[PDB]
Amino acid sequence: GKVQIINKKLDLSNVQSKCGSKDNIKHVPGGGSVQIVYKPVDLSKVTSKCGSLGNIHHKPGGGQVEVKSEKLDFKDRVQSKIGSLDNITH
Amino acid sequence: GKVQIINKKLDLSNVQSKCGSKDNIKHVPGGGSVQIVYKPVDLSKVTSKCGSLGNIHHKPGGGQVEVKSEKLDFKDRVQSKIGSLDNITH
Amino acid sequence: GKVQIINKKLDLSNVQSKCGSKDNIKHVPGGGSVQIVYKPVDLSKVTSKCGSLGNIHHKPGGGQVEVKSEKLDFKDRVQSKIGSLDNITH
Amino acid sequence: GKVQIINKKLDLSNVQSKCGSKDNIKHVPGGGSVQIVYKPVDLSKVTSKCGSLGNIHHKPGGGQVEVKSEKLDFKDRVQSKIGSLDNITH
Amino acid sequence: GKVQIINKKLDLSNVQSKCGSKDNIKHVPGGGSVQIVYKPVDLSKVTSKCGSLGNIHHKPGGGQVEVKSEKLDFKDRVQSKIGSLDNITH
Amino acid sequence: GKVQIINKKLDLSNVQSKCGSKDNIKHVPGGGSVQIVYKPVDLSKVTSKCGSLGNIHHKPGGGQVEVKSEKLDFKDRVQSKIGSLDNITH
Amino acid sequence: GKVQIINKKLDLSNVQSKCGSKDNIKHVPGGGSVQIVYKPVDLSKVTSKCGSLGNIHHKPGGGQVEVKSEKLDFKDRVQSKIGSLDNITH
Amino acid sequence: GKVQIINKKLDLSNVQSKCGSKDNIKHVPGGGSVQIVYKPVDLSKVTSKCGSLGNIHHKPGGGQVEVKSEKLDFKDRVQSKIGSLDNITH
Amino acid sequence: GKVQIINKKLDLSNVQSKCGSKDNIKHVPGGGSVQIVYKPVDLSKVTSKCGSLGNIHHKPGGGQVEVKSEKLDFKDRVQSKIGSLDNITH
Amino acid sequence: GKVQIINKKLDLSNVQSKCGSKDNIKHVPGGGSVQIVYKPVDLSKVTSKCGSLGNIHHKPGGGQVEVKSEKLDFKDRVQSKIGSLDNITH
Amino acid sequence: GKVQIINKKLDLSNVQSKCGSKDNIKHVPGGGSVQIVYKPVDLSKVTSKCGSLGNIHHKPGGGQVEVKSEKLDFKDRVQSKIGSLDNITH
Numbered sequence: 001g002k003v004q005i006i007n008k009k010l011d012l013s014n015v016q017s018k019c020g021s022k023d024n025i026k027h028v029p030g031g032g033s034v035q036i037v038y039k040p041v042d043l044s045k046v047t048s049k050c051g052s053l054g055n056i057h058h059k060p061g062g063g064q065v066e067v068k069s070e071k072l073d074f075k076d077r078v079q080s081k082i083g084s085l086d087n088i089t090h
Numbered sequence: 091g092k093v094q095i096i097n098k099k100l101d102l103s104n105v106q107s108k109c110g111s112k113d114n115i116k117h118v119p120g121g122g123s124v125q126i127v128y129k130p131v132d133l134s135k136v137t138s139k140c141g142s143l144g145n146i147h148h149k150p151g152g153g154q155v156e157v158k159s160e161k162l163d164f165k166d167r168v169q170s171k172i173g174s175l176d177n178i179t180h
Numbered sequence: 181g182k183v184q185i186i187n188k189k190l191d192l193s194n195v196q197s198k199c200g201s202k203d204n205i206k207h208v209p210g211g212g213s214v215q216i217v218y219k220p221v222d223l224s225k226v227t228s229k230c231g232s233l234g235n236i237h238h239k240p241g242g243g244q245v246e247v248k249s250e251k252l253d254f255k256d257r258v259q260s261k262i263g264s265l266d267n268i269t270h
Numbered sequence: 271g272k273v274q275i276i277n278k279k280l281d282l283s284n285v286q287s288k289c290g291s292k293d294n295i296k297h298v299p300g301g302g303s304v305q306i307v308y309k310p311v312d313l314s315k316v317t318s319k320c321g322s323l324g325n326i327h328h329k330p331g332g333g334q335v336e337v338k339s340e341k342l343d344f345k346d347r348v349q350s351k352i353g354s355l356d357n358i359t360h
Numbered sequence: 361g362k363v364q365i366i367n368k369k370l371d372l373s374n375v376q377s378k379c380g381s382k383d384n385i386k387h388v389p390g391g392g393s394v395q396i397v398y399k400p401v402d403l404s405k406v407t408s409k410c411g412s413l414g415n416i417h418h419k420p421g422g423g424q425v426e427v428k429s430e431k432l433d434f435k436d437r438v439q440s441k442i443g444s445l446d447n448i449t450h
Numbered sequence: 451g452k453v454q455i456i457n458k459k460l461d462l463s464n465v466q467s468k469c470g471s472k473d474n475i476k477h478v479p480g481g482g483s484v485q486i487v488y489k490p491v492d493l494s495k496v497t498s499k500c501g502s503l504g505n506i507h508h509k510p511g512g513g514q515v516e517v518k519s520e521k522l523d524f525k526d527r528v529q530s531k532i533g534s535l536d537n538i539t540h
Numbered sequence: 541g542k543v544q545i546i547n548k549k550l551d552l553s554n555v556q557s558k559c560g561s562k563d564n565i566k567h568v569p570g571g572g573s574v575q576i577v578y579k580p581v582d583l584s585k586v587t588s589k590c591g592s593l594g595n596i597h598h599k600p601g602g603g604q605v606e607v608k609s610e611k612l613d614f615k616d617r618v619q620s621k622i623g624s625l626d627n628i629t630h
Numbered sequence: 631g632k633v634q635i636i637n638k639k640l641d642l643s644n645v646q647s648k649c650g651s652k653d654n655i656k657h658v659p660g661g662g663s664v665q666i667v668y669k670p671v672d673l674s675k676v677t678s679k680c681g682s683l684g685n686i687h688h689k690p691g692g693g694q695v696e697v698k699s700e701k702l703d704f705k706d707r708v709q710s711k712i713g714s715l716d717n718i719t720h
Numbered sequence: 721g722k723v724q725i726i727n728k729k730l731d732l733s734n735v736q737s738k739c740g741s742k743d744n745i746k747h748v749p750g751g752g753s754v755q756i757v758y759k760p761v762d763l764s765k766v767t768s769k770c771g772s773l774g775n776i777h778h779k780p781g782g783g784q785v786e787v788k789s790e791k792l793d794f795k796d797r798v799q800s801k802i803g804s805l806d807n808i809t810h
Numbered sequence: 811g812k813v814q815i816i817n818k819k820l821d822l823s824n825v826q827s828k829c830g831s832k833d834n835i836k837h838v839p840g841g842g843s844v845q846i847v848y849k850p851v852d853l854s855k856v857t858s859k860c861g862s863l864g865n866i867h868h869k870p871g872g873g874q875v876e877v878k879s880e881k882l883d884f885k886d887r888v889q890s891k892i893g894s895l896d897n898i899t900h
Numbered sequence: 901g902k903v904q905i906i907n908k909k910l911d912l913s914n915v916q917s918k919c920g921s922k923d924n925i926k927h928v929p930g931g932g933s934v935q936i937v938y939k940p941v942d943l944s945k946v947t948s949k950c951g952s953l954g955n956i957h958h959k960p961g962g963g964q965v966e967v968k969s970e971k972l973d974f975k976d977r978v979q980s981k982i983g984s985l986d987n988i989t990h
Contacts, residue, residue, distance in 0.1 A: 001091045001092070001812065002091065002092045002811070002813065003093045003094065003813045003868065003958065004095075004813065004814045004815070005096070005814075005815045005816075005866050005956055006095075006096045006815070006816045006817060007096060007097045007098060007817045007864065007866065008099075008817060008818045008819065009100065009818075009819045009864065010819065010820045010821065011101045011102065011103045011821045012102045012103065012821065012822045013103045013104075013822065013823045013824070013825065013858070014103070014104045014823075014824045014825065014826070015104065015106075015826075015856050015858055016105075016106045016109075016825075016827070016829050016856075017106070017134075017826075017827045017828065017829070017854045017855070017856050018107065018108045018134070018827070018854050019106050019107070019109045019110050019826075019829045019830075020109075020110045020831075021112070021113075021830075021831045021833060022111070022831070022832045022834070023111060023112065023113045023114075023129070024114045024115070024833075024835075025114075025116070025126065025128075025834070025835045026115075026117055026834070026835070026836045026837065027116065027117045027836055027837045028117065028120075028124055028838045029119045029121075029838065029839045029840055030118065030119055030121040030212065030838075031122050031839075031840040031841045031930075032122045032179060032840045032841050032843050032844070032899065032930065033123045033125075033178065033179045034122070034124045034125070034838055034843075034844045034845070035124070035125045035126075035175065035843075035844070035845045035846070035897075036125070036126045036127070036835065036845075036846045036847075036848070037126075037127045037172065037846070037847045037848065037850070038126070038127065038128045038129055038849075039128075039129045039833070039848055039849045039852060040129065040130045040131060040170060040172065040851075041130075041850060041851045041852065042129060042132045043133045043168070043852070043853045044107045044133070044134045044135075044828070044854045044855070045107070045134070045135045045854075045855045046105050046106075046107050046135070046136045046137070046856045046857075047136075047137045047164070047856070047857045047858075048137075048138045048139070048857070048858045048859055048860075049138055049139045049143075049858070049859045050137070050138075050140045050141050050162055050859075050860045050861075051140075051142075051162065051860050051861045052141055052143070052160060052861075052863075053141070053143045053144070053859075053862070053863045053864050053865075054099065054143050054144045054145075054864045055142065055143075055144070055146070055147075055864075055865045055866070056095050056097065056146045056187075056865070056866045057147045057865075057867045057868065057869070058093065058095065058147065058148045058149070058150075058183065058185065059147070059148075059149045059150070059154075059156075059868070060150045060151075060152075060869070060870045060871060061150060061152025061153065061154065061242055061870075061871045061874075062870075062872045062873035062874060062961055062963070063152035063153045063154075063871065063873045063874070064151075064152060064153070064154045064155070064871065064873075064874045065155045065156065065874070065876075066156045066869075066874070067156065067157045067158070067878075068157075068159075068878045068879065069158065069159045069160065069879045069880075070159075070161075070861075070862060071161045071163075071880075071882075071883075072161075072162045072163075072860055072881065072882045073162065073163045073164075073881075073883045073884075074163075074164045074857070074883075074884045074885070075164070075165045075166075075884075075885045075886070076165070076166045076167070076886045076887075077166075077167045077168075077886070077887045077888070078167070078168045078169075078851070078853070078887075078888045078889070079168070079169045079170070079890070080131075080170045080171075080889070080890045080891070081171045081172065081890075081893070082172045082850065082891065082892045082893045082983075083171070083172045083173045083174055083175065083262075083893045083894075084173075084175075084893055084896075085175045085845065085847075085893065085894075085895045085896065086175065086176045086177070086896045086897070087125075087176070087178070087843045087896070087897045087898070088177070088179065088843065088897070088898045089179045089180070089843045089899045089900065090179060090180045090899070090900045091181045091182070092181065092182045093182065093183045093184065093868065094184045094185075095184070095185045095186070095868065096185075097186060097187045097866075098188045098189075099188065099189045099190065100189075100190045101190065101191045101192065101193045103193045103194075104193070104194045105196075106194070106195075106197075107196070107197045107198070107224075108197065108198045108224070109196050109198065109199045109200050110199075110200045110201075111200075111201045111202070111203075112201070112202045113201060113202065113204075113219070114202070114203065114204045114205070114206070115204075115205045115206070115218075116205075117206065117207045118208045118210075118214055119211075120209055120210045120211040120212045120214060120301075120302065121212050122212045122269055122840065123214075123215075123267045123268065123269045124215070125216075125265065125267060126215070126216045126217070127216075127217045127262060128216070128217065128218045129218075129219045130221060130260060130262065131220075131258070131260055132219060132221065132223070133222075133223045133224070133258070134197045134198050134223070134224045134225075135197070135224070135225045135256075136195050136196075136197050136225070136226045136227070137226075137227045137228070137254070138193070138228045138229070139228055139229045139230075139233075140227070140228075140229075140230045140252055141231045141250075141252065142231055142233070143231070143232075143233045144187065144189065144233050144235075145234070145235045145236070145237075146185050146235070146236045146237065146275055146277075147237045147239075148183065148237065148239070148240075148273065148275065149238075149239045149240070149244075149246075150240045150242075151240060151241045151242025151243065151244065152242045152871055153242035153243045153244075153332070154242060154243070154244045154245070154246070155244070155245045155246065156245075156246045157247045157248070158248045158249075159248065159249045159250065160249075160251075161250065161251045161252065161253075162252045162253075163252065163253045163254075164253075164254045165254070165255045165256075166255070166256045166257070167256075167257045168258045168259075169258070169259045169260070170259070170260045170261075171260070171261045172261075172262045172893075173261070173262045173263045173264055173265065173352075174263075174264045174265075175262075175265045176265065176267070177213075177215075177266070177267045178267070178268045178269065179269045179270070180269060180270045181271045181272070182272045183272065183273045183274065184275075185274070185275045185276070186275075186276045187276060187278060188279075189278070189280065190279075190280045191280065191281045191282065191283045192282045193283045193284075194283070194284045195283065195284065195286075196284070196285075196286045196287075196289075197286070197287045197288070197314075198287065198288045198314070199286050199288065199289045199290050200289075200290045200291075201290075201292070201293075202291070202292045203291060203293045203309070204292070204293065204294045205294075205306065205308075206295075206296045206297055207297045208297065208298045208299065208300075208304055209299045209301075210298065210299055210300045210301040210302045210391075212302045212359055213304075213305075213357045213358065214302070214304045214305070215304070215305045215306075215355065215357060216305070216306045217307045217352065217355075218306070218307065218308045219309045220307070220309065220310045220311060220350060220352060221310075221348070221350055222311065222312045222313070223312075223313045223314070223348070224287045224288050224314045224315075225287070225314070225316075225346075226286075226287050226315070226316045226317070227318070227344070228283070228285055228317070229318055229319045229320075229323075230317070230318075230319075230320045231321045231322075231340075231342065232321055232322045232323070233321070233322075233323045233324070234279065234323050234324045235323075235324070235326070235327075236275055236277065236325070236326045236327065236367075237327045237329075238273065238275065238327065238328045238329070238330075238363065238365065239327070239328075239329045239330070239334075240331075240332075241330060241332025241334065242332045243332035243333045243334075243422070244331075244332060244333070244334045244335070244336070245334070245335045245336065247336065247337045247338070248338045248339075249338065249339045249340065250339075250340045250341075251340065251341045251342065251343075252341075252343075253341075253342065253344075254343075254344045254345075255344070255345045255346075256345070256346045256347070257346075257347045257348075258347070258348045258349075259349045259350070260311075260349070260350045260351075261350070262352045263351070263352045263353045263354055263355065263442075264353075264354045264355075265352075265355045266354075266355065266357070267303070267305075267357045267358070268357075268358045268359065269359045269360070270359065270360045271361045272361065273362065273363045273364065274364045274365075275364070275365045275366070276365075276366045277366060277367045277368060278368045278369075279368065279369045279370065280370045281370065281371045281372065281373045283373045283374075284373070284374045285373065285374065285375045285376075286375075286376045286379075287376070287377045287378070287404075288377065288378045288404070289376050289377070289378065289379045289380050290379075290381075291380075291381045291382070291383075292381070292382045293381060293383045293384075294382070294383065294384045294385070294386070295385045295386070295396065295398075296386045297386065297387045298388045298389065298390075298394055299389045299391075300388065300389055300390045300391040300392045300394060300481075300482065301391045301392050302392045302449060303393045303394075303448065303449045304392070304394045305394070305395045305396075305445065306396045306397070307396075307442065307445075308396070308397065308398045308399055310397070310399065310401060310440060310442065311400075311438070312399060312401065312402045312403070313402075313403045313404070313438070314377045314378050314403070315404070315405045315436075316375050316376075316405070316406045316407070317407045317434070318375055318407075319408055319409045319410075320407070320408075320409075320410045320411050321411045321430075321432065322412045322413070322430060323411070323413045323414070324369065324413050324414045324415075325412065325413075325414070325416070325417075326365050326367065326415070326417065326457075327419075328363065328365065328417065328418045328419070328420075328453065328455065329418075329419045329420070329424075329426075330420045330421075330422075331420060331421045331422025331423065331424065331512055332422045333423045333424075333512070334421075334422060334423070334424045334425070334426070335425045335426065336425075336426045337426065337427045337428070338427075338429075339429045339430065340429075340430045340431075341430065341431045341432065342431075342432045343431075343432065343433045343434075344433075344434045344435075345434070345435045345436075346435070346436045346437070347436075347438075348437070348438045349438070349440070350439070350440045350441075351440070351441045351442065352442045353441070353443045353444055353445065353532075354443075354444045354445075355442075355445045356444075356445065356446045356447070357393070358449065359392065359449045359450070360449060360450045361451045361452070362451065362452045363452065363453045363454065364455075365454070365455045365456070366455075367456060367457045368458045368459075369458065369459045369460065370459075370460045371461045371462065372463065373463045375463065375464065375465045375466075376464070376465075376466045376469075377468070377494075378467065378468045378494070379466050379468065379469045380469075380470045380471075381470075381472070381473075382471070382472045383471060383472065383473045383474075383489070384472070384473065384474045384475070385474075385475045385476070385486065385488075386475075386476045386477055387476065388477065388478045388479065389479045390479055390480045390481040390482045390484060390572065391481045391482050392482045392539060393484075393537045393539045394482070394484045394485070395484070395485045395486075395535065395537060396485070396486045396487070397486075397535075398487065398488045399489045400487070400489065400490045400491060400530060400532065401491045401530055402489060402493070403492075404467045404468050404493070404494045404495075405467070405495045405496075405526075406466075406467050406496045406497070407496075407498070408465055408497075408498045408499070409498055409499045409503075410497070410498075410500045410501050410522055411501045411502075411520075411522065412501055412503070413501070413503045413504070414459065414503050414504045414505075415503075415504070415506070416455050416457065416506045416507065416545055416547075417507045417509075418453065418455065418507065418508045418510075418543065418545065419507070419508075419509045419514075420510045420511075420512075421510060421512025421513065421514065421602055422512045423512035423513045423602070424511075424512060424514045424516070425515045425516065426515075426516045427516065427517045427518070428518045428519075429518065429520065430519075430520045430521075431520065431521045431522065431523075432521075432522045433521075433522065433523045433524075434523075434524045434525075435524070435526075436525070436526045437526075437528075438527070438528045438529075439528070439529045440491075440529070441531045441532065443531070443532045443534055443535065443622075444534045444535075445532075445535045446534075446535065446536045446537070447485075447536070447537045447538070448537070449482065449540070450540045451541045451542070452541065452542045453543045454544045455544070456545075457546060457548060458548045458549075459549045459550065460549075461551045461552065462552045462553065463553045464553070465555045465556075466555075466556045466557075466559075467556070467558070467584075468557065468558045468584070469556050469557070469558065469559045470559075470561075471560075471561045471563075472561070472562045473561060473562065473563045473564075473579070474562070474563065474564045474565070474566070475564075475565045475566070475576065476567055477566065478567065478568045478569065478574055479569045480568065480569055480570045480571040480572045480574060480661075480662065481571045481572050482629055483572050483573045483574075483627045483628065483629045484572070484574045484575070485574070485575045485625065485627060486575070486576045486577070487576075487622065488576070489579045490577070490579065490580045490581060490620060490622060491580075491581045491618070491620055492579060492581065492583070493583045493618070494557045494585075495557070495584070495585045495616075496555050496556075496557050496585070496586045496587070497587045497588070497614070498553070498555055498587070498588045498589070499588055499589045499590075499593075500588075500589075500591050500612055501590075501592075501610075501612065502591055502592045502593070502610060503591070503592075503593045503594070504547065504549065504593050504595075505592065505593075505594070505595045505596070505597075506545055506547065506595070506596045506597065506635055506637075507597045508543065508545065508597065508598045508599070508600075508635065509597070509599045509600070509604075509606075510600045510602075511600060511602025511603065511604065511692055512602045513602035513603045513604075513692070514601075514602060514603070514604045514605070514606070515604070515605045516606045517607045517608070518607075518608045519608065519609045519610065520609075520610045520611075521611045521612065521613075522611075522612045522613075523611075523612065523613045524613075524614045524615075525614070525615045525616075526615070526616045526617070527616075527617045527618075528617070528618045528619075529619045529620070530619070530621075531620070531621045533621070533624055533625065533712075534625075535622075535624075535625045536624075536625065536626045536627070537573070537575075537626070537627045537628070538627075538628045538629065539629045539630070540630045541632070542631065543632065543634065544634045545634070545635045546635075546636045547636060547637045548638045549638065549639045550640045551640065551642065552642045552643065553643045553644075554643070554644045555644065555645045555646075556644070556645075556646045556647075556649075557648070557674075558647065558674070559646050559647070559648065559649045560650045560651075561653075562651070562652045563651060563652065563653045563654075564652070564654045564655070564656070565655045565656070565668075566655075566656045566657055567656065567657045568657065568658045568659065568660075569659045569661075570658065570659055570661040570662045570664060570752065571661045571662050572662045572719060573664075573665075573717045573718065573719045574664045574665070575664070575665045575666075575715065575717060576665070576666045577666075577667045577712065577715075578666070578667065578668045578669055579668075579669045580667070580669065580670045580710060580712065581670075581708070581710055582671065583672075583674070583708070584647045584648050584673070584674045584675075585675045585706075586645050586647050586675070586676045586677070587677045587678070587704070588643070588645055588677075588679070589678055589679045589680075589683075590677070590678075590680045590681050590702055591681045591682075591700075591702065592681055592682045592683070592700060593682075593684070594637065594684045594685075595682065595683075595685045595687075596635050596637065596685070596686045596687065596725055597687045597689075598633065598635065598687065598689070598690075598723065599687070599688075599689045599690070599696075600690045600691075600692075601690060601691045601692025601693065601694065601782055603692035603693045603694075603782070604691075604694045604695070605694070605695045606695075607696065607697045607698070608697075608699075609698065609700065610699075610700045610701075611700065611701045611702065611703075612702045613701075613703045613704075614703075614704045614705075615704070615705045615706075616705070616706045616707070617706075617707045618707070618709075619709045620671075620710045621710070621711045621712065622712045623711070623712045623713045623714055623715065623802075624715075625712075625715045626714075626715065626716045627663070627665075627716070627717045627718070628719065629662065629719045629720070630719060630720045631722070632721065632722045633722065633724065634724045634725075635724070635725045635726070636725075636726045637727045637728060638729075639728065639729045639730065640729075641731045641732065641733045642732045643733045643734075644733070644734045645733065645734065645735045646735075646736045646737075646739075647737045647738070647764075648737065648738045648764070649738065649739045650739075650740045650741075651740075651741045651742070652741070652742045653741060653742065653743045653744075653759070654742070654743065655744075655745045655746070655758075656745075656746045656747055657746065657747045658747065658748045658750075659751075660748065660750045660751040660752045660754060661751045662752045662809060663752050663753045663754075663755075663808065663809045664752070664754045664755070665754070665755045665756075665805065665807060666755070666756045667756075667757045667802065667805075668756070668757065668758045668759055669758075669759045670757070670759065670760045671760075671798070671800055672759060672761065672762045673762075673763045673764070674737045674764045674765075675764070675765045675766075675796075676735050676736075676737050676765070676766045677766075677767045677768070677794070678733070678735055678768045679768055679773075680767070680769075680770045680792055681770075681772075681790075681792065682771055682772045682790060683772075683774070684727065684729065684773050684775075685772065685773075685774070685775045685776070686725050686727065686775070686776045686777065687777045687779075688723065688725065688777065688778045688779070688780075689777070689778075689779045689780070689784075690780045690781075690782075691780060691781045691782025691783065691784065692782045693782035693783045694782060694783070694784045694786070695786065696785075697786065697788070698787075698788045698789075699790065700789075700790045700791075701790065701791045701792065701793075702791075702792045702793075703791075703792065703793045703794075704794045704795075705794070705795045705796075706795070706796045707796075707797045707798075708797070708798045708799075709798070709799045709800070710800045710801075711800070711801045711802065712802045713801070713802045713803045713804055713805065714803075714804045714805075715802075715805045716804075716805065716806045716807070717753075717755075717806070717807045717808070718807070718808045718809065719752065719809045719810070720809060811901045812903065813903045813958065814903065814905070815904075815905045815906075815956050815958065816905070816907060817907045817954065817956065818907060818908045818909065819908075819910075819954065820909065820910045820911065821911045822912045823911045823912065823913045823914070823948070824914045824915065824916065825915045825916075825948055826915075826917070826919050826946075827916075827917045827918065827919070827944045827946050828917070828918045828919065828944050829916075829919045829920075830919050830921075831920075831921045831922070831923060832921070832923065832924070833921075833923045834924045834925075835924070835926075836924070836925070836926045836927065837926055837927045837928065838928045838930065839928065839930055840928075840930045841929075841930040842930045842931050842933050842934070842989065843933045843987070844928055844930060844934045844935070845933075845935045845936070845987075846925065846935075846936045846937075846938070847936070847937045847938065847940070848925075848938045848939075849923070849938055849939045849940065849942060850940045850941075851940060851941045851980075852942045852943075853942070854917075854918070854943070854944045854945070855944075855945045856945075856946045857946070857947045857948075857950070858947070858948045858949055858950075859948070859949045859950075860951075861950050861951045861952055861953070862952045862953075862955065863952070863954050863955075864954045864955070865954075865955045865956070866955070867955075867956065867957045867958065867959070868958045868959075869957075869958070869959045870958075870959070870960045870961060871960075871964075872961025872962045872963035872964060873961065873963045873964070874961065874965070875964070875965045876959075876964070876965065876967065877967045877968075878967070878968045878969065879968075879969045879970075880951075880969065880970045880971065881970075881971045881972075881973075882950055882951065882972045882973065883971075883973045883974075884947070884974045885974075885975045886945075886975075886977075887976070887977045887978070888941070888943070888977075888978045888979070889979045889980070890940060890981070891980075892937065892981065892982045892983045892985075893983045893984075894983055895935065895937075895984075895985045895986065896986045897986070897987045897988070898933065898987070898988045899932060899933045899988065899989045899990060900989070
């Protein structure tokens with residue numbers, strides 16, 4: 001007589017990335033050959049709640065069989081180069 | 091006699107990326123050959139709640155069979171270069 | 181006698197990307213050969229609630245068979261170059 | 271005697287991309303050969319609620335068979351170049 | 361005796377892209393050969409609620425057979441170049 | 451005795467793209483050979499509720515057979531170039 | 541004894557594209573050979589509720605057979621070039 | 631004894647494209663050879679509720695057979711060029 | 721004993737394209753050889769409720785056979801060029 | 811007589827990355843050939859709640875069999891180089 | 901007679917990375933050939949709540965069998981180089 005199962009959840013989770021920089025360049029009075037190269041590669045990435053979540057099952061009977069499988073797989077790559085930069089004065 | 095199963099969820103999750111920069115360049119009084127190259131590659135990416143979620147099943151009987159499979163797979167790549175930059179004064 | 185299953189969900193999730201920059205260039209009093217190249221590649225991307233979600237099933241009887249399969253797969257790539265930039269004064 | 275299954279959902283989710291920039295260029299008093307190249311490639315992309323969602327099934331009887339399959343697949347790419355930019359004064 | 365299944369949903373989801381820029385160029389007092397190239401490639405794209413959604417089925421009897429299949433597939437690409445830009449003063 | 455299935459949905463979803471720019475060019479006091487090239491390629495695209503949605507089926511009897519298939523497929527591409535731009539003063 | 545199935549839907553969804561720009565060019569006091577090329581390629585595109593929607597079926601009997609198939613497919617492309625632009629003063 | 635199926639729908643969906651620009655050119659005090667080329671290619675396109683929608687079927691009997699097929703397919707392309715533009719002063 | 725099927729729909733959908741521009745050119749005080757080329761290619765296109773919609777069928781008997789097929793297909797293309805534009809002063 | 815199982819959870823977890831920098835460059839009075847290369851590669855990445863979560867099962871009967879499997883797998887890599895940078899005075 | 905099991909959890913955990921730097925470069929009065937290369941590679945990464953969490957099971961009967969397996973696996977790598985940097989005075 002009787003069976004029971006329950007659940008409850010809450011999230012208020014914060015998952016920011018790179019969300020508040022203040023980059024800037026200023027004030028060059030000059031007289032000679034100034035040069036700048038600034039922050040030449042930048043990235044951000046966020047991933048959440050992937051895969052199998054929240055499912056419910058009900059399967060009565062003594063003779064049965066069951067099989068399952070799962071996978072998750074993530075990859076990234078980056079490359080960069082800077083050249084023959086030149087300046088002279090007089 | 092009787093069976094029961096329940097669920098509940100809430101989300102208020104925040105998943106920002108690169109959401110608040112303040113990039114700028116200013117004030118060049120000059121007299122000589124200034125040059126700048128600024129932030130030449132930039133990216134952001136967000137992914138959420140992929141895969142299998144929230145499903146419900148009900149399958150009574152003792153003789154049965156069951157089989158399942160799943161996968162998730164994500165990839166990215168980036169490349170960059172900077173050249174023969176030149177300046178002279180006088 | 182009796183079976184039951186239930187569900188409930190809520191979302192208020194925020195999933196922004198690159199949503200608030202303030203890029204600018206200003207004030208060049210001059211007299212010599214200034215040059216700038218600004219932020220030459222930029223991207224953002226968001227993906228959400230893909231795959232199988234929210235399905236409901238009901239399949240009574242002891243002799244049955246069942247089989248399932250799933251996949252998700254995402255890819256990206258980027259390339260960039262900067263040239264023979266030149267300036268002189270006098 | 272009896273079976274039951276239920277559901278409920280809500281969304282108020284926000285999924286912005288690049289939604290609020292303030293790009294600008296200003297104030298060139300001159301006297302020498304200024305040059306600028308600004309933000310030469312830009313993109314944004316959003317995708318949501320793809321695949322199989324919200325379906326309901328009901329299939330009584332002990333002798334049956336069942337088979338299913340699914341896929342999702344997304345790809346992107348980008349390329350860029352900058353040339354023989356030149357300036358002189360006097 | 362009896363079977364039941366139910367559903368309910370709501371959406372108020374927001375899915376903007378590039379929706380609020382403020383691009384501008386201003387104020388050139390001159391005297392020498394100014395040049396500008398501005399933001400030369402720009403894109404945005406949004407896709408939503410694709411695939412199979414909201415279907416309902418009812419199929420009683422023990423001897424049956426069933427088979428299904430699905431796919432989704434999205435692709436994009438972009439290219440750009442900038443030339444032999446030149447300016448002189450005096 | 452008895453079977454039942456139900457449904458309900460609502461949408462108030464917003465799916466804008468590029469909906470609010472403020473592009474402009476101004477104020478050239480002159481005296482030397484100014485030149486501009488502005489935003490030379492621009493696009494936006496939106497797609498929604500494609501595929502199979504909202505269908506209802508009812509098919510009693512134990513001996514039957516069933517088969518289904520589906521696909522979705524989207525593609526885009528873009529190219530651009532800028533030339534031998536030239537200016538002189540005096 | 542008895543079967544039932546139901547449905548209901550609502551939409552108030554908004555699917556704008558490029559709907560509110562404010563492009564303009566102004567104020568050239570002159571004295572030297574100004575030139576401009578403005579926004580030379582522009583597009584927007586929207587597609588909605590394509591495919592199979594809202595169908596209803598009823599097919600009793602145990603001996604039957606059924607087969608179905610579906611497809612959706614969308615493509616676009618764009619190209620652009622800018623020439624030997626020239627100006628002189630004095 | 632008895633069968634039933636129902637439906638209901640509503641739409642108030644908005645599907646605008648390029649619906650509110652404010653393009654203009656102004657104020658040229660002159661004295662030297664000004665030239666402009668403005669927005670030389672522009673397009674917008676909207677498509678909605680294509681394919682198979684709203685059909686109803688009723689086909690009792692155990693011995694039958696059924697077969698169906700569907701397709702949708704959309705394509706576009708664009709090209710543009712700008713010439714040997716020239717101006718002189720004095 | 722008994723069968724029933726029902727339907728209902730409403731639309732108030734809005735499907736505008738390019739519906740509200742404000743293009744204009746003004747104010748040329750002159751003294752030197754001004755020239756303009758304005759917006760030289762423009763298009764808009766809308767398509768709606770194509771294909772098969774609203775049909776109703778009723779076909780009792782166990783021995784029958786059925787076959788169907790459908791297609792939709794849309795295409796567009798555009799090309800443009802600008803010439804040897806020239807102006808002189810004095 | 812009777813069985814019971816329960817659950818409850820809460821999250822208020824914060825998962826930031828690189829969220830608050832203040833990068834800047836300033837004040838160059840000049841007279842000799844200054845040069846800078848700034849922060850040329852930058853990244854951040856966040857991943858959360860992947861795998862199998864929140865599932866519920868109920869499977870009575872003494873004769874049965876069960877099998878399961880799972881995997882998670884994440885990878886990244888980065889490369890960078892800096893060139894023949896040169897400056898002279900007098 | 902009777903069985904019971906319970907659970908409860910809370911999190912307020914903070915999992916920041918690199919969240920508050922203040923990088924800057926300043927004040928170069930000059931007269932000789934200054935050069936700088938700043939922070940040329942930077943990264944941060946966070947991962948949380950991966951694997952199997954929160955599941956509930958109920959499986960009565962004396963004759964049964966059970967088997968399970970799990971894995972988690974994470975990898976990263978980085979490389980960098982700096983070149984033939986040169987400066988002279990007089």
